[PDB]
Amino acid sequence: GPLGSVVRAKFNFQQTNEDELSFSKGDVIHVTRVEEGGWWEGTHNGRTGWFPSNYVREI
Numbered sequence: 001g002p003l004g005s006v007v008r009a010k011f012n013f014q015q016t017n018e019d020e021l022s023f024s025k026g027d028v029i030h031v032t033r034v035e036e037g038g039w040w041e042g043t044h045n046g047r048t049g050w051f052p053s054n055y056v057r058e059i
Contacts, residue, residue: 005031007042007056021049029056 007029015022023029023044029051033041040053 003030006059007031008059009056011055013051013055015049019050021047021051023051028059031056 009023009025009027009029012024013020013022021029021042021044027044029042029044031040031042032048034053035041038053039050040056041048041050044051
């Protein structure tokens with residue numbers, strides 16, 4: 001830790017490049033960086049990458 005913000009995926013997402021995560025609806029992501037522009041960074045199933053912020057909700 002410290003385990004910061006945790007969000008849950010609202011939808012599946014398929015990575016389109018090496019910087020992006022792939023995840024499934026309902027998966028948890030630990031959000032470790034937020035930037036303007038609609039893409040955030042976090043850890044999912046042991047991998048760090050970027051994902052659309054509108055695809056998740058905080059839990």
